[PDB]
């Protein structure tokens, strides 16, 4: 149960380093001891401290389950969280190598990381503040606007394809072993000036990823690698803010072992034992705020039943445009969505908010709040989206299958609400409420494939009775509708024989269009009940035609109906849309 103290301002590196009286000055000292830590051991940084040009790497060690390694703060809360700032320095730089093709991507190279956790299990990092700033780079999200001239705003970017990859925090498994019980709590990562382009290097706010311990060159490497898997388990990332980072905000689970997970795409189903063995289990991503990532907000990759809840994404895809994403090379990737999964099995995304995913007008080929990408059994529920530049939800191409999307609310998402380009079968879209403004419509123009629409409230938030295109394409049977409400439309889907039609949204819900237009300044999520309840406009009014109008639903993907958008138990015959009448 040893416990180190690092100050700076009060510290001195000649000191013993143990006890509050005798703190170390720098993190150089922590790094010399870092590999020997230490179940029950800790390293407390002093609130107020500023470790400029420093970093904290921890390689090849662990806690046990009775006593994890800490790394946290000490002293007066009110002095502000201790800063670790690596400023890209030589010491923070390491050679990253997946040791395998991981698709059309940089898989290998130099990386600056401020807080590196390489095969460290039973560790918990908390109450820190992490930067990886470059003074040459500055384009803050708080004052970002699109201008006719690049870097007009007193701003400046490094648009080089070969820009050094930078991370705030990286967790790396590359021993052929599990890395487990890693917890990140109440961190404030920002100004990680990474590579604008690279998706699968440790490049952005937080990134967890796994490598083969060696290149797969023979019969005998391939027997071993099949059994000995760098993977994650019980990774928890909560109460943190990531802000002004390139590329990814928060990404977890990309792995060289996709060479076995993706060997046979088949019909897009994903075997339970495959994803359990080669993928990351018990990943949880809770109560985070992500703002002004260059690319995607939060993304789970190759994860087995992860839980993504109470997070707020906001104004991401900042550099996915034609004036910033100028060197895509043969890698491409001028696309980003909000909060979503890649080749996961039955991920649950619930009670999230996603706002203002940017730049679909300016070269972001996606720009959606939610994206059930390739993967199987994705569940998006009780989420709110506002103001995304391209759709609320995409279901992406052949191997995006068995999606459920329910009890979500979409408000002023632009250029289509649902984006269904060549997606696989098994998708179910029910009890959602969508407010569709003149800048949008129900489906994206490029939509062409499967979804079953039931119990939804579609709201034409324009000043005429709109004649909507309810159907595009027929790939995998295209779009079928049953038991939905259409508000203020001239037409309905020809496939719906249980249509409920309403003339005027004011007799259907208390105040449609009135949910927030912005994240809370703190980045915490909006209240749904009590004095600050931000969603009461989407409640059905007395005599609403949405009361007891929905069919009992049978979820295509075996997820039992539990509650509504506001935590209320769904009774017998459900109400239409996302919110039951009280
Ligand atoms: Na900067």
From TrEMBL:
Ca(2+) binds at residues 133-134, 137, 193. It comes from the Bacteria. This is Lacto-N-biosidase. The lineage of its organism: Bacteria, Bacillati, Actinomycetota, Actinomycetes, Bifidobacteriales.
